[PDB]
Write an enzyme that holds these catalytic residues in place. Structure first.
Site, PDB file in Angstrom:
ATOM      1  N   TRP A  56       1.605  -3.171   4.003  1.00  0.00           N
ATOM      2  CA  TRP A  56       1.705  -4.523   4.524  1.00  0.00           C
ATOM      3  C   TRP A  56       1.465  -5.518   3.392  1.00  0.00           C
ATOM      4  O   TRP A  56       0.332  -5.717   2.956  1.00  0.00           O
ATOM      5  CB  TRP A  56       0.719  -4.741   5.682  1.00  0.00           C
ATOM      6  CG  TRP A  56       0.948  -6.010   6.457  1.00  0.00           C
ATOM      7  CD1 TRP A  56       1.604  -7.127   6.018  1.00  0.00           C
ATOM      8  CD2 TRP A  56       0.504  -6.308   7.797  1.00  0.00           C
ATOM      9  NE1 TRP A  56       1.602  -8.087   6.987  1.00  0.00           N
ATOM     10  CE2 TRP A  56       0.926  -7.624   8.088  1.00  0.00           C
ATOM     11  CE3 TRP A  56      -0.225  -5.613   8.776  1.00  0.00           C
ATOM     12  CZ2 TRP A  56       0.644  -8.248   9.309  1.00  0.00           C
ATOM     13  CZ3 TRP A  56      -0.492  -6.224   9.988  1.00  0.00           C
ATOM     14  CH2 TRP A  56      -0.063  -7.526  10.252  1.00  0.00           C
TER      15      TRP A  56
ATOM     16  N   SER B  66      -6.026   2.552   4.603  1.00  0.00           N
ATOM     17  CA  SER B  66      -5.455   1.668   3.596  1.00  0.00           C
ATOM     18  C   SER B  66      -6.517   0.740   2.997  1.00  0.00           C
ATOM     19  O   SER B  66      -6.360  -0.480   3.031  1.00  0.00           O
ATOM     20  CB  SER B  66      -4.299   0.866   4.144  1.00  0.00           C
ATOM     21  OG  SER B  66      -3.491   0.388   3.073  1.00  0.00           O
TER      22      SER B  66
ATOM     23  N   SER C 158       0.800  -1.220   0.000  1.00  0.00           N
ATOM     24  CA  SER C 158       0.000   0.000   0.000  1.00  0.00           C
ATOM     25  C   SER C 158       0.842   1.284   0.000  1.00  0.00           C
ATOM     26  O   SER C 158       0.291   2.377  -0.098  1.00  0.00           O
ATOM     27  CB  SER C 158      -1.051  -0.007   1.072  1.00  0.00           C
ATOM     28  OG  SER C 158      -1.776  -1.231   1.039  1.00  0.00           O
TER      29      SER C 158
ATOM     30  N   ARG D 104       5.213  -1.008  13.234  1.00  0.00           N
ATOM     31  CA  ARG D 104       5.858  -0.231  12.187  1.00  0.00           C
ATOM     32  C   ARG D 104       5.949   1.230  12.619  1.00  0.00           C
ATOM     33  O   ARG D 104       7.019   1.842  12.605  1.00  0.00           O
ATOM     34  CB  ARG D 104       5.103  -0.369  10.865  1.00  0.00           C
ATOM     35  CG  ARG D 104       5.053  -1.796  10.328  1.00  0.00           C
ATOM     36  CD  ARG D 104       4.145  -2.037   9.131  1.00  0.00           C
ATOM     37  NE  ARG D 104       2.765  -1.619   9.383  1.00  0.00           N
ATOM     38  CZ  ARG D 104       1.768  -1.627   8.497  1.00  0.00           C
ATOM     39  NH1 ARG D 104       1.974  -2.038   7.259  1.00  0.00           N
ATOM     40  NH2 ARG D 104       0.564  -1.214   8.853  1.00  0.00           N
TER      41      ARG D 104
HETATM   42  C1  LIG Z   1      -2.816  -2.484  11.024  1.00  0.00           C
HETATM   43  C2  LIG Z   1      -3.672  -3.424  10.154  1.00  0.00           C
HETATM   44  O1  LIG Z   1      -4.855  -3.835  10.854  1.00  0.00           O
HETATM   45  C3  LIG Z   1      -4.095  -2.909   8.768  1.00  0.00           C
HETATM   46  C4  LIG Z   1      -3.273  -1.789   8.203  1.00  0.00           C
HETATM   47  O2  LIG Z   1      -3.087  -0.629   8.543  1.00  0.00           O
HETATM   48  N1  LIG Z   1      -2.898  -2.582   7.219  1.00  0.00           N
HETATM   49  C5  LIG Z   1      -2.481  -2.504   5.958  1.00  0.00           C
HETATM   50  C6  LIG Z   1      -1.393  -1.628   5.461  1.00  0.00           C
HETATM   51  O3  LIG Z   1      -0.726  -0.938   6.271  1.00  0.00           O
HETATM   52  O4  LIG Z   1      -1.129  -1.587   4.246  1.00  0.00           O
HETATM   53  C7  LIG Z   1      -3.252  -3.418   5.331  1.00  0.00           C
HETATM   54  S1  LIG Z   1      -3.289  -3.655   3.669  1.00  0.00           S
HETATM   55  C8  LIG Z   1      -4.083  -5.134   3.051  1.00  0.00           C
HETATM   56  C9  LIG Z   1      -3.880  -6.409   3.857  1.00  0.00           C
HETATM   57  N2  LIG Z   1      -4.230  -7.502   2.902  1.00  0.00           N
HETATM   58  C10 LIG Z   1      -3.998  -7.063   1.500  1.00  0.00           C
HETATM   59  C11 LIG Z   1      -2.959  -7.909   0.703  1.00  0.00           C
HETATM   60  N3  LIG Z   1      -3.400  -8.669  -0.329  1.00  0.00           N
HETATM   61  O5  LIG Z   1      -1.748  -7.898   0.956  1.00  0.00           O
HETATM   62  C12 LIG Z   1      -3.640  -5.574   1.655  1.00  0.00           C
HETATM   63  C13 LIG Z   1      -4.088  -4.171   6.354  1.00  0.00           C
HETATM   64  C14 LIG Z   1      -5.536  -3.710   6.292  1.00  0.00           C
HETATM   65  C15 LIG Z   1      -3.440  -3.830   7.703  1.00  0.00           C
END
Ligand SMILES: C[C@@H](O)[C@H]1C(=O)N2C(C(=O)O)=C(S[C@@H]3CN[C@H](C(N)=O)C3)[C@H](C)[C@H]12
Length: 244
Positions: A190, A97, A50, A230
């Site tokens: 992430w 995000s 992201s 992070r």
């Molecule tokens: C703190 C946490 O609960 C939440 C957050 O902030 N996150 C972020 C971020 O920093 O990019 C994501 S992105 C998402 C996760 N799954 C998707 C993927 N296929 O990789 C993409 C989460 C929602 C995780």
């Protein structure tokens, strides 16, 4: 006052104590410093995840695929995170995000325009492949932590190839903390559909005086860590070096 041996030791410890491996590159003017407990990560390639949202937003607004006031309606499908099951602006989507919104934007831009824009900006390895909607999550787009802070440096100083207006539009979306009297602009990433998982926090500090101190934290996420480590590591490090 404090020796660089102690700064280095303290910042290594922040990563040690969270049971991960990673780095944070800090840029002061034109000079790049590497910290953490895995310094060799600095020039390795990871998917941006992201963190891409920043550029995606730039491209979308520049090319009139969206407005900063525009409400992206939730389609009503079950969302993996319930904080996503609502209507939002690119801005709200940035903080949360909200990948579905950024996927919509990618689709509006379209694969062709996406490929050209990413070559033009020269972001990471610059390959986006054939899937306009997931390239930043699972590849083939990859970037180094050094590249990320340089991208953050460009954007903090409005040096990217986009209207100043576009840049300011996207920067206003990025404010995450005010500490002391400094402002922290950044985007988390992430990467969950890559093995091992990668975690990012890229942006800059804008201090009271007006100087801008760009940074990129990057580390391995392991099953069941909280995403805010992070943030926490980043904050302690910036504070250790007296940048905040
Ligand atoms: C703190 C946490 O609960 C939440 C957050 O902030 N996150 C972020 C971020 O920093 O990019 C994501 S992105 C998402 C996760 N799954 C998707 C993927 N296929 O990789 C993409 C989460 C929602 C995780």
């Amino acid at each position: 006052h404090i020796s660089s041996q102690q700064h280095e030791k303290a910042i290594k410890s922040y990563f040690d104590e969270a049971q991960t491996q990673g780095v944070i590159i800090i840029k002061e003017g034109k000079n790049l410093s590497t910290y953490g407990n895995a310094l060799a990560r600095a020039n390795k390639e990871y998917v941006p995840a992201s963190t891409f949202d920043m550029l995606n937003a730039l491209i979308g607004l520049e090319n009139h695929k969206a407005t900063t006031n525009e409400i992206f309606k939730w389609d009503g499908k079950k969302r993996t995170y319930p904080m996503w099951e609502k209507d939002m602006t690119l801005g709200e989507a940035m903080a949360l995000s909200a990948v579905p919104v950024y996927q919509e934007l990618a689709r509006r831009t379209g694969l062709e325009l996406m490929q050209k824009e990413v070559k033009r900006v020269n972001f990471g390895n610059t390959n986006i492949g054939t899937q306009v909607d997931n390239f930043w999550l699972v590849g083939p787009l990859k970037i180094t932590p050094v590249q990320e802070v340089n991208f953050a440096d460009d954007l903090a100083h409005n040096r990217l190839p986009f209207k100043l207006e576009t840049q300011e539009e996207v920067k206003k979306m990025l404010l995450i903390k005010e500490v002391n009297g400094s402002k922290i602009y950044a985007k988390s990433g992430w990467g969950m559909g890559v093995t091992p998982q990668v975690g990012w926090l890229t942006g800059w500090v804008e201090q009271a005086n007006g100087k801008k101190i760009p940074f990129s934290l990057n580390l391995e996420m392991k099953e069941g860590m909280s995403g805010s480590i992070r943030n926490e590591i980043t904050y302690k490090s910036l504070e250790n070096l007296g940048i905040i």
